[PDB]
């Protein structure tokens, strides 16, 4: 009769799917609550500058 392309016939899946996703690259920036300076300035008086 004739020939047929492979895609012309319905394909049923005989495979089991596993969707493994990678862990994304991340960056940590320098973060701090109070800098060394802020702590120095927190004092009411400084002997050196006085």
């Amino acid at each position: 009769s004739h020939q047929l392309s492979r895609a012309d016939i319905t394909t049923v899946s005989t495979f089991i799917d596993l969707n493994i996703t990678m862990l994304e690259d991340h960056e940590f920036v320098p973060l701090e609550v109070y800098t060394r300076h802020e702590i120095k300035d927190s004092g009411l008086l400084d002997y050196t500058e006085v």
Partner: protein, 51 residues
């Protein structure tokens, strides 16, 4: 939390009063005492004279 102090501007008016007692020798002079003091400038001199 806030740890920095509240900062503002101020102006200080005062007078440095220094009274010195000196003994004059034959060939030299000497300090027998130097009294140094700080005195407030009154309101009637800050407003009326300085300002």
């Amino acid at each position: 939390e806030n740890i920095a102090p509240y900062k503002f501007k101020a102006t200080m008016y005062y007078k440095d009063v220094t009274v010195s007692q000196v003994w004059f020798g034959h060939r030299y002079s000497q300090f027998m005492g130097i009294f140094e003091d700080r005195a407030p400038v009154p309101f009637e001199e800050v407003i009326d004279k300085i300002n």
